[PDB]
Amino acid sequence: HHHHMKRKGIILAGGSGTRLHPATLAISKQLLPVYDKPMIYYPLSTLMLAGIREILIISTPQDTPRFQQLLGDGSNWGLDLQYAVQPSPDGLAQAFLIGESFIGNDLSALVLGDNLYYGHDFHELLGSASQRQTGASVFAYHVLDPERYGVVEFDQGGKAISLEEKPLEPKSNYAVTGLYFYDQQVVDIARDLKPSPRGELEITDVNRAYLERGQLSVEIMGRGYAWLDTGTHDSLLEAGQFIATLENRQGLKVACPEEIAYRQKWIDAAQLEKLAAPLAKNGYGQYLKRLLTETVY
Amino acid sequence: MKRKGIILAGGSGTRLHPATLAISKQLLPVYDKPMIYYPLSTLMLAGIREILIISTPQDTPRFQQLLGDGSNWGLDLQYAVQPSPDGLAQAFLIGESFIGNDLSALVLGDNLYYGHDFHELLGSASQRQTGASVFAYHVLDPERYGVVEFDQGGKAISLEEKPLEPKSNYAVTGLYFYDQQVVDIARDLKPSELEITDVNRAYLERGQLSVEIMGRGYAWLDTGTHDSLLEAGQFIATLENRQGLKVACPEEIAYRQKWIDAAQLEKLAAPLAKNGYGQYLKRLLTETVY
Amino acid sequence: HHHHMKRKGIILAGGSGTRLHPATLAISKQLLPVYDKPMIYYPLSTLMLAGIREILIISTPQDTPRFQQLLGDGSNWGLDLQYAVQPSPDGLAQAFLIGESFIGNDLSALVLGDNLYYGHDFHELLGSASQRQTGASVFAYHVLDPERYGVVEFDQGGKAISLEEKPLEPKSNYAVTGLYFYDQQVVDIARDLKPSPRGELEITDVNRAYLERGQLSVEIMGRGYAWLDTGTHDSLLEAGQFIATLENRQGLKVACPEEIAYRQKWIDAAQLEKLAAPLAKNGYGQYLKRLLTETVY
Amino acid sequence: MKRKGIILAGGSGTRLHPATLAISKQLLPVYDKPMIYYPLSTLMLAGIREILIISTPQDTPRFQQLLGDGSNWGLDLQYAVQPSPDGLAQAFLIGESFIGNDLSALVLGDNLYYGHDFHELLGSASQRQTGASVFAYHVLDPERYGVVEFDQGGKAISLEEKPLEPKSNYAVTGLYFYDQQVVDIARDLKPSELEITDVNRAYLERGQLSVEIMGRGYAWLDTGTHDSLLEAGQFIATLENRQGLKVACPEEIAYRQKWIDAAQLEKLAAPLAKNGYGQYLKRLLTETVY
Ligand SMILES: Nc1c(NC(=O)c2ccccc2)c(=O)[nH]c(=O)n1Cc1ccccc1
Ligand SMILES: Nc1c(NC(=O)c2ccccc2)c(=O)[nH]c(=O)n1Cc1ccccc1
Ligand SMILES: Nc1c(NC(=O)c2ccccc2)c(=O)[nH]c(=O)n1Cc1ccccc1
Ligand SMILES: Nc1c(NC(=O)c2ccccc2)c(=O)[nH]c(=O)n1Cc1ccccc1
Ligand SMILES: [Cl-]
Ligand SMILES: [Cl-]
Ligand SMILES: [Cl-]
Ligand SMILES: [Cl-]
């Protein structure tokens, strides 16, 4: 027949299996707080910073109602939030099959629900990835332990020439972060994925697909950014200390969704005033109130 | 006489919202385990095996899922709800039939204790068949708590809940031992909240309150703020990683109290075998820890 | 008679009096480590990032030999380091009287020896301040406790219109950080300063002087930067945790002077190899060695 | 018999360079006070007032400036140098004339201890007039230390310094009590370094080594890395800020041992009056701390 561009977001905030049991037995990792807010506020704030307003949250059946209770339909923050369940954790690239109907014919963005980013001109780094309407965009960050991640190899010109998932002998220390930008080809790339030996559909196979077509942009997220680790109990604790230090220093919050919707002009002063009221007695609501007065450059 | 325990893990209101908007504080981890493991481990260390967990209606199912009926750790867990947050002393009205004609002990679900000879320090409270024991602890901010005042001879002469002008820096901790009188004292309480400090004052007036000092060489950790939640997890991380030993591991404590045997400990470590907690429980079977 | 532009740096790493006694009784604050290196490496690294190679370190008479033992004459790192003593702490603006001969007819830069900065495109933020050959440049950063600092007030257009030192009622939450860029007028501005009521020559009077002549640029250092606090034992501990978290995450060091001189091309591979050798057994020397191999973007 | 003390605060080589390039580790603060205050406070808590500080030649003047002759805190401090880092047992050759015919105790200048009833735990070692006492502590990484092996009955049967295959996870801590034999045992040692574990093995072979367990409810903190230095300061910050009480404050401990009086404590707090440490010492004059 005959047919005659915006970008949707997906947050994968599914099962971390038993790795962090028993800490995570009664509740999933992405609802645990990092200092003063739930973990999912951070990657959600990241999507919002990319200008993305229509967002699918993928979680386990057990925990979806709790994600729904925390976040609603998004209307309070100028967003539209929908929900989908992942019955079993079959790999990150399942997000695109699970989210196939949500995505439709649009461009998309995947963020892991346990990743947090901090640093200056992050809005602008996401802007270039979001503005690119063709191909895929990922970010490479220097890490101590690249063997844990998808690793990107660069030629002497600085061109990305290979990707490898958890290599025993990394070709560089540049890990692919858990924020991915995709055009309309990804659902089709995802549907042709064959499981890997450990029973998972690998995002690195999706990104390699783009690489082999010449449509993978790999931007460096520099060392002046913090891409923090929530993979261990220890790293979770370091992520909370990190955010506490920045917030207590500056009197500004990292990854406050109310604030970000306010600054984007997705909600207005009066709506922000309403969101503050039920939290007026604690520091978070008193912080939302203070935003109405102050110019923050 | 057998002593029954109660963990009160009720609501903290909106004070830590949005961090606790999704789920109650006592289910969140402190470092490597759910917060409630810590006060539970305290009761177990006092020899207490029959225990009532009281939480909000929304969250009981989840305490219940986490901990079950206790039988896997040689405990006998029961559960009950606190519909609204109307004071710690409701624990004894909600827990009345559970307690029966027995001695009891109440620990708050968010209190963490650490230190040497804690088993002994709780032994002396536990073995008192008569009266009540509580613990006083020096703190920077006594206004936040029940404050005990002492005479020059070291005798408790008043308790005050959240006084504007604390009489001392001694704060009553969230661990309480009681005889058969506490239910009836709980039942005649009048709202101020139904205050645990009124329960303890009732025993004080009758010369039946033992106020033992919990010395400066014990850790009574603060989980009342986001900052103090953090310091607590850092505090436990430092101890566990220095020693290769875990703080408030119920499976280990059951095993050491001989409430479960080596074969049961082995089955418990099986599901967790690929991570550090299972590896740890496996390592306990063949190492002597003094 | 008849006469016929580079920028020199000064690090003020003098007396913190008795405020941090007894921690600082046997040694000055600026030699205490922040995680894995001495505190003075951080502000020194900041000057180096601004392209500054000729640097005066001002310390107490008691501690100069220890600053000299740590840092030498700078030749090992492609720098020229000189030393001057401050017999009594009479205020930060004394740096210009103490450093009058060192400065000569050049432009200058003052950094406090206990300030540390982290964040992306810091090189570029310093570049604009350093390239400005006229007037003064300072940086304003949002803090929880502006009452502790020099506070900058902005009009609705975002123009700086006043400065106040430790105001009881701050006009904004924007504090002036401890990095200052100056033209050839500063030594003369400094020499006319009259002590303040508490017996100190105030840098805020110097900056107000520039403001009243229309030659103070106040650039915002955004919230995506960390300007960390070493004013208390607590904040010192948070600064060390902060740097440990970033360094252990990335496998890169913050404020490694050897690395920065290497990357600037002030020293070469073989010199860096020599600086590594006496530290080869510890993580710091093994890190200097690894830099010779790897491309870090 | 009077027992004299030695703090060994010698060189850590280049291991923490460049952080310690400027000055030795034991002069750096842990949170709010210089590291050496902590092992010093340990000796004081054991009743030890006559103390020899041994440090590198470069740094002695500065230990000497920091601490003086001790008289202001009711101590009697002396000082001596360790020219090179040739093993902890040199402490007894360097300290030989200082020790004389007396009993002695050696603490490493970078060891931190915390916990309840520490005064008592050191009392039982201190009061032994014969033989040597050391402390064993469970740790994750016993290879880094002197490792003690026990028989099924809990008796020490071997000590090994930094074994490649530790026999247990029990590590000997950096606090050692000795009788009059240690100098002569130190003097017959042969370089392996002159090893403190050889000194302790000499007493073991003669049935004269008391190996007491320092339980899991005590903190023996690690200052051997940059990471463990940090965890230690965080650990002390959390205790001091929770309690409003300081850990290892020599002035306070002198005052409580009645080695200095209220008027002396008052003069000590005067120079520090504008900061928290002086304010703290002033606050100790009019508060009862149990
Ligand atoms: N840039 C901001 C902002 N600022 C904005 O989102 C913003 C939005 C529109 C215009 C200007 C600034 C904020 O309010 N909170 C915040 O954490 N950041 C940093 C951030 C945001 C999301 C994820 C990681 C870091
Ligand atoms: N004392 C123990 C023990 N020891 C025991 O449970 C025990 C009990 C009876 C006999 C032998 C060991 C332990 O295994 N785990 C633990 O965390 N502690 C300390 C502790 C226990 C509860 C709360 C805070 C600290
Ligand atoms: N930008 C760098 C760099 N990179 C450089 O200095 C550099 C120098 C010349 C060209 C490219 C990069 C570094 O090596 N270490 C470092 O801590 N930073 C960040 C930094 C440097 C100084 C003060 C605060 C943060
Ligand atoms: N026990 C005390 C005390 N208590 C005393 O010194 C003391 C000694 C004799 C009688 C009464 C109190 C103190 O004041 N400060 C302190 O840090 N402690 C614990 C301690 C002391 C040294 C090292 C590690 C922990
Ligand atoms: Cl960067
Ligand atoms: Cl104690
Ligand atoms: Cl920014
Ligand atoms: Cl113990």
What do these coordinates show?
- The structure is a homotetramer.
- With 297 residues, the first copy, chain A, is an alpha/beta fold.
- Chain A has a single domain, classed as Spore Coat Polysaccharide Biosynthesis Protein SpsA, Chain A (Alpha-Beta Complex), CATH 3.90.550.10.
- Helix content of chain A is 32%, strand content 22%.
- Chain A is built from 11 helices and 14 strands.
- In chain A, the strands form 5 sheets. Chain A has a 5-stranded mixed β-sheet with strand order 5-4-1-6-12, with helices on one face.
- In chain A, a hairpin with a 2-residue loop joins strand 2 (33-34) and strand 3 (37-38).
- The longest helix of chain A is centred in the last third of the chain and has 18 residues, at 233-250.
- Chain B binds chain D through residues 114-118, 136-141, 150, 154, 169-170, 213, 215-222, 228, 231, 234-235, 237-239, 241-245, 287-290, and chain D through 114-118, 136-141, 150, 154, 169-170, 213, 215-222, 228, 231, 234-235, 237-239, 241-245, 287-290.
- Chains A, C: Residues 8-244 form the Nucleotidyl transferase domain.
